[PDB]
Amino acid sequence: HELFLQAFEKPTQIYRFLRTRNLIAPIFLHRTLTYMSHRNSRTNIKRKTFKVDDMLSKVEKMKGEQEVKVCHKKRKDVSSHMVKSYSLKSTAPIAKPLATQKLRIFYQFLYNNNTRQQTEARDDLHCPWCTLNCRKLYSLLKHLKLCHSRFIFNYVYHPKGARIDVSINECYDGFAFSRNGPVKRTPITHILVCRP
Amino acid sequence: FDDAVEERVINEEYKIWKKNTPFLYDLVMTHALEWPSLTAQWLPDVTRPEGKDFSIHRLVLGTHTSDEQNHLVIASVQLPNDDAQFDASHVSGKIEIEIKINHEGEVNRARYMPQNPCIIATKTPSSDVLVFDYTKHPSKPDPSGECNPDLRLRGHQKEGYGLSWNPNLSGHLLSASDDHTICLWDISAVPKEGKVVDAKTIFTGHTAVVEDVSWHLLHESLFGSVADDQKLMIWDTRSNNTSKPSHSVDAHTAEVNCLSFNPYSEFILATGSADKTVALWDLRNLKLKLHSFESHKDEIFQVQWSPHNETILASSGTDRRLNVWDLSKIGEEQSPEDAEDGPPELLFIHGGHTAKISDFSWNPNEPWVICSVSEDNIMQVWQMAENIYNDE
Ligand SMILES: [Zn+2]
């Protein structure tokens, strides 16, 4: 029965909302992720050969081959002009001269432990929530698991077959807060990553 | 009230970032400073204790208070050694204040003297620029609040942020201010007793607020300045005209906020503007802009070259992200999928900050380690996943 949207839909929208938002300003390049490695088509060998002084010569050749009283200061927020808050060809424009066979993966949706609605996106390993093409099956699972933690993804193989069991995560919720100017905090360190 | 929505949307994205940090970094340390800092500068020294699983790195931080006493801070960062692992979420001693010196106003910028890194210049909200020797003050502060700047330097009528010590000339310090002037102090000779020092020279070129100022790295007589002029100026101390610079470049389409000279090239420098782009300049021919680094979604306030790599550059602004650029990557062929993420020149995006990044510093001892401080009081000591820049 379509009561499934009472568990789902809300997250599906949060992720659709963020799809438009994250396209505009990223938190990271997908290509920089260790599991998304393949997205980057390019390499790093061009660097030990690269000499920044040789750049002008090239640009020249290119151009040649053309014939409470809280005042919001711009740098800080001290606690018209200077926004006041109370609550009690020119070089100038942009220059870029040196630039210029199909698998089916089934998604079984679980709601109130049992009851499964199964949607298939033979569209390869494309992310049902953020449209992104994960290209590789290992990547898709990591992508889903980490970029869509409002859900719980469990991979089941079968020769028919392959399926991702999607459930609703039950343990969701240095963050952001309503601050006027400077704020006193309780000092505390945290090591999020540390690789040998 | 879209700003109240913007808050949750930020935190949903901070969660996503967190969750993926293991796949983007070799290191992430996140620390909430008691009071936020408007400055960050990795000190050049390293303590490498005998048979320990880490090294001691020090930072020149500062405060910004809401009706409280301000300090010139020196904290210590414990960074793991290559063989060693160690993971925490502090109860252990990893990041902690070593010295807290009394400061009269919020520290705009704090920069050490390359020649003697015990000497730290500071940009204060009050007109005057102060110089402190951290060895000359106690490690535990005076509760009187009594700030005794080792030297006071007058010449500016307003506060500013640009601050530069001449590497090749000891004691030569430059300041940029909202008063359109650049002041030049020489403390080397003329150290004496007399606590107040008046500027040797004052550069009255710019037509708006002077955002930044930096010396050139090989010529002791050359320096650059950027203002809300939308211009970059190349000055020669040697010249007698303090109103006309050697060159006045129409650098950007908006307020230029920062400049940084390449430590490997005697020609290359970069500029960060409000125009959301980083511009690349060659001193040899200033009539041509070499390239415009596009990706920032808002004003850029800090542009800094990587000490360890000639082609690596980083920028931080009001889009809460810090971008890392590789010039060797400029105009590389990308797959449509590859292109999707960003220009080839864009190497990395640091999405760990939930607020505007005030300053950042590249660690001079550990390649690819960066310290980025934001207004939300957070200080991150991060280092991107080696696979991003390394090839097997
Ligand atoms: Zn997705």
Swiss-Prot record, chain A:
Residues 1-24 are annotated as: Interaction with JARID2 and EPOP. A zinc finger (C2H2-type) spans 125-148. Induction: Expression is induced by E2F1, E2F2 and E2F3. Overexpressed in breast and colon cancer. Changing residue 75 to A: Fails to form a PRC2.1 dimer. Sumoylated, probably by PIAS2. The record marks 11-12 as: Breakpoint for translocation to form JAZF1-SUZ12 oncogene. It is found in: Nucleus. Component of the PRC2 complex, which consists of the core subunits EED, EZH1 or EZH2, SUZ12, and RBBP4, and various combinations of accessory subunits including AEBP2, JARID2, PHF19, MTF2 and EPOP. Within the complex, interacts (via C2H2 zinc finger domain) with JARID2 and EPOP; JARID2 and EPOP compete for SUZ12 binding. Also interacts with AEBP2 and PHF19. Forms a monomeric PRC2.2 (class 2) complex consisting of at least SUZ12, RBBP4, AEBP2 and JARID2. Polycomb group (PcG) protein. Component of the PRC2 complex, which methylates 'Lys-9' (H3K9me) and 'Lys-27' (H3K27me) of histone H3, leading to transcriptional repression of the affected target gene. The PRC2 complex may also serve as a recruiting platform for DNA methyltransferases, thereby linking two epigenetic repression systems. Genes repressed by the PRC2 complex include HOXC8, HOXA9, MYT1 and CDKN2A. Belongs to the VEFS (VRN2-EMF2-FIS2-SU(Z)12) family. It is linked to A chromosomal aberration involving SUZ12 may be a cause of endometrial stromal tumors. Translocation t(7;17)(p15;q21) with JAZF1. The translocation generates the JAZF1-SUZ12 oncogene consisting of the N-terminus part of JAZF1 and the C-terminus part of SUZ12. It is frequently found in all cases of endometrial stromal tumors, except in endometrial stromal sarcomas, where it is rarer. Under hypoxic conditions, the precursor SUZ12 RNA undergoes regulated trans-splicing with the JAZF1 RNA, resulting in a chimeric isoform which may be protective against apoptosis. The chimeric transcript is characterized by JAZF1 exons 1-3 joined to SUZ12 exon 2-16. The chimeric transcript is expressed primarily in the endometrium from late secretory and early proliferative phases of the menstrual cycle, but not in normal myometrium at any phase of the cycle. Its expression is slightly induced by low levels of progesterone, but suppressed by both estrogen and high levels of progesterone. This is Polycomb protein SUZ12. It comes from Homo sapiens. The lineage of its organism: Eukaryota, Metazoa, Chordata, Craniata, Vertebrata. The gene is SUZ12. The chain holds residues 83 to 533 of 739 of the full protein.
Curated annotation (Swiss-Prot), chain B:
Changing residue 257 to A: Decreased interaction with ZNF827. The modification N6-acetyllysine is found at residue 140. Residues 1-112 are annotated as: Interaction with ARMC12. Signal peptide: none annotated. The keyword RNA-binding does not apply. The lineage of its organism: Eukaryota, Metazoa, Chordata, Craniata, Vertebrata. Changing residue 28 to A: Loss of interaction with ARMC12. PROSITE patterns: WD_REPEATS_1, WD_REPEATS_2, WD_REPEATS_REGION. It holds the Pfam family WD40. This is Histone-binding protein RBBP4. Keywords: Acetylation, Cell cycle, Chaperone, Chromatin regulator, Chromosome, DNA damage, DNA repair, DNA replication, Isopeptide bond, Nucleus, Phosphoprotein, Repeat, Repressor, Telomere, Transcription, Transcription regulation, Ubl conjugation, WD repeat.
